[PDB]
A paper describes a structure:
C1GalT1 is an essential inverting glycosyltransferase responsible for synthesizing the core 1 structure, a common precursor for mucin-type O-glycans found in many glycoproteins. While the addition of α-GalNAc is controlled by twenty different GalNAc-Ts, the elongation of the α-GalNAc (Tn antigen) in all cells is typically determined by a Golgi follow-up inverting galactosyltransferase, termed C1GalT1 or core 1/T-synthase (CAZy31). This GT synthetizes the core 1 disaccharide, also called T antigen (Galβ1-3GalNAc-α-1-O-Thr/Ser). In particular, our data show that C1GalT1 is a GT-A fold dimer that follows the typical SN2 mechanism for inverting GTs with an Asp residue as the catalytic base.
To provide atomic insights into the structure of DmC1GalT1 and its interaction with UDP-Gal/UDP and glycopeptides, we worked with a truncated version of DmC1GalT1 (residues S73-Q388) that was secreted from High Five (Hi5) cells. Crystals of the DmC1GalT1 in the presence of UDP-MnCl2 and APDT*RP were obtained in the space group P21. The asymmetric unit (AU) of P21 crystals contained two molecules of DmC1GalT1 that were arranged as a homodimer with each monomer adopting the typical GT-A fold. The PISA server further confirmed this dimeric structure and revealed that the dimer presented a large buried surface area (7621 Å2), implying a very stable and tight interface. The uridine moiety of UDP establishes a CH–π interaction with Leu155 while the uracil moiety is tethered via hydrogen bonds to Glu150 and Lys158 side chains and Gly151 backbone. The ribose moiety of uridine interacts with the Asp182 side chain and Met160 backbone, and the pyrophosphate interacts with Arg152, His324 and Tyr325 side chains. The pyrophosphate group oxygen atoms, Asp181 and Asp183 of the DxD motif and His324 hexagonally coordinate Mn2+. The glycopeptide GalNAc moiety is recognized through hydrogen bonds formed between the acetamide carbonyl and Ser220 side chain, OH3 with Asp255 side chain, OH4 with Asp255/Tyr218 side chains, and OH6 with Tyr304 side chain. At the peptide level, the Pro2 side chain and the methyl group of Thr4 establish CH–π interactions with Tyr213, and Trp300/Tyr304, respectively, and the Thr4 backbone makes a hydrogen bond with Trp300 side chain. Our structural studies also show the striking finding that the enzyme imposes a non-natural staggered conformation to α-GalNAc-Thr linkage that is typically found in α-GalNAc-Ser.
Numbering used by the authors:
A (entry chain B): 86 to 366
B (entry chain G), D (entry chain F): 2 to 6
C (entry chain A): 87 to 365
The structure:
């Protein structure tokens, strides 16, 4: 048994809308298994595709397929969400169909922040954007105010926001959001451990690639060696998670526990004023 | 470039 | 965070864990058992054919090779009886690719008297009337079970196979049946398994639906497995790689969903000597 | 029988 009263209270206080980037080839292979595992824990779940689907209730964006249209799907998805859902949630998560999210830990992190604060969160990378951008795979989450500025202020200005549908989806949104004064939040826990991860847990717990010019060690905004220390007790996301591994993470995180070791929740910080972030780590 | 595992 | 209940069971249900390994595996596998779940046992012993400073490995007078594993099991339980029989209540055999949630083992064992002749594990039906326990999944003997094994079965070649060849887990299954040690039932009160011979994915998502697979024929209690397979207090998985030991550690002990507080089921009442749980 | 993989 579990007492989930605290997490049910945050469910209603911190509404998270989760949108999942997918394509028809992945509808049954991947997207389905996101819906059956972590997806159903979101306040609102939306599959953003190029074609409709009964099972997912998928939204067909007016955007072709291929890696060359991911940026066009991101733009159309946030436009759609602004059009139809901007008052349906406080926070707007973009994830892939190989992202795994512990939604309860996301609400924990977001609790203090005003949805009216222009900010987004994720795994922060250094290149192409002065204030950093967030890994598309690890998932990144925008405030209501961040989604407003994106759709109302960035998209209509080609100088601020790339108008072609080509490019790294996560770099491009990073640029649009810096250009409309949306802050790149710090998603690390109060001990400085990461919460958003672009790889599976093993790859962060046991880094095999050893600072050998591998892109990750050059991209990471906050310097860390990772290892057994890498990862918060309230980590939020992992990526390159296989459909089967979605169900295993669900089992080991939500179900399996060592008898007589009771997780005691850290106290919730006090709510912040509009425009204010937590003290830096 | 792409940046994979 | 609050580990009061688990600290209380630590002292009330003493578990000695021995790990079957060999010199080739000392650094590749055995080390990672010690650094993860091994240190949560009341007593940890590596049972090898050669010594090792890091592990403090016991060198059994037994050659290497899969045809001497039965010889290592016999010599390990002899050693444990000789030197450790009153150092613990329960005596776990595991491989160096077994992963054990030791706190969940204490939970299962709490009600049982160490003086009851019983052992537990993943129960298989062939070769032994009352069944035998998977060597990989790990199996745990009562003090009274270890006494009977070393003092009553080992000396008697009619009760207990004297050559060092054969399936280690089948052979101990036979020795223990012959000295009236009971094959306990390690399933939880909802009938979900706690001891598993494969990794979690293989039980959560059974791939060999191919029903000719040996596992579906060997299993003593009928189950479909699937997303239902596995207890919230599962005890062991097997064919766990050294790296996967650290992942299971992290996901089980460290990562948790904020504001979902695991509330422990109340401990059953202690049982009389000779008594098993019902159902 | 050998029930290893
Ligand atoms: O032609 C494509 C290729 C990928 N995707 C989606 O884009 C994201 C990136 O794909 P993937 O996870 O395969 O690669 P990654 O970028 O994480 O290496 C995922 O949400 C995919 O479902 C897509 O919609 N159409
Ligand atoms: O020549 C050998 C082969 C295996 N083992 C040990 O025997 C057990 C079973 O082997 P493994 O886990 O490799 O295979 P499994 O039998 O589980 O399929 C392990 O604890 C190994 O360390 C050994 O001591 N000597
Ligand atoms: C790696 O960097 C590229 C740009 O160089 C993209 O932003 C890509 O999405 C990144 N990969 C991950 C997993 O975040
Ligand atoms: C499979 O069965 C054989 C005997 O047929 C051995 O007991 C072997 O150890 C078993 N494997 C597992 C993983 O329990
Ligand atoms: Mn991906
Ligand atoms: Mn093994």
């Amino acid at each position: 048994h579990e007492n989930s009263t605290i997490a049910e209270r945050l469910y209603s206080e911190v509404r998270v809308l989760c949108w999942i980037m997918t394509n028809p080839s992945n509808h049954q292979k991947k997207a389905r298994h996101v819906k059956r595992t972590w997806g159903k824990r979101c306040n609102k779940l939306i599959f953003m595709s190029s074609a409709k689907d009964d099972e997912l209730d998928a939204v067909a964006l007016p955007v072709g397929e291929g890696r060359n249209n991911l940026w066009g799907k991101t733009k159309e998805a946030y436009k759609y969400i602004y059009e139809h859902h901007i008052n349906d949630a406080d926070w707007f998560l973009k994830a892939d169909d190989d992202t795994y999210t512990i939604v309860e830990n996301m609400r924990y992190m977001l609790y203090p922040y005003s949805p009216e604060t222009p900010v987004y969160f994720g795994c922060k990378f250094k290149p192409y954007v002065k204030q950093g951008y967030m890994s598309g795979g690890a998932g990144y989450v925008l405030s209501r105010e961040a989604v407003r500025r994106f759709v109302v202020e960035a998209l209509p200005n080609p100088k601020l926001c790339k108008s072609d549908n080509s490019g790294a989806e996560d770099v491009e949104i990073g640029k649009c959001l810096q250009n409309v004064n949306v802050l790149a939040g710090d998603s690390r826990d109060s001990n400085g451990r990461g919460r958003f991860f672009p790889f599976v847990p093993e790859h962060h717990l046991i880094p095999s690639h050893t600072d050998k010019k591998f892109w990750y060690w050059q991209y990471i905004f906050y310097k860390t060696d990772e290892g057994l220390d890498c990862c918060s007790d309230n980590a939020i996301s992992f990526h390159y998670v296989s459909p089967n591994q979605m169900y295993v993470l669900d089992y080991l995180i939500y179900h399996l526990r060592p008898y007589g070791i009771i997780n005691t929740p850290d106290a919730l910080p006090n709510k912040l004023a509009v425009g204010e972030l937590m003290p830096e780590i | 470039p792409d940046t994979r595992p």
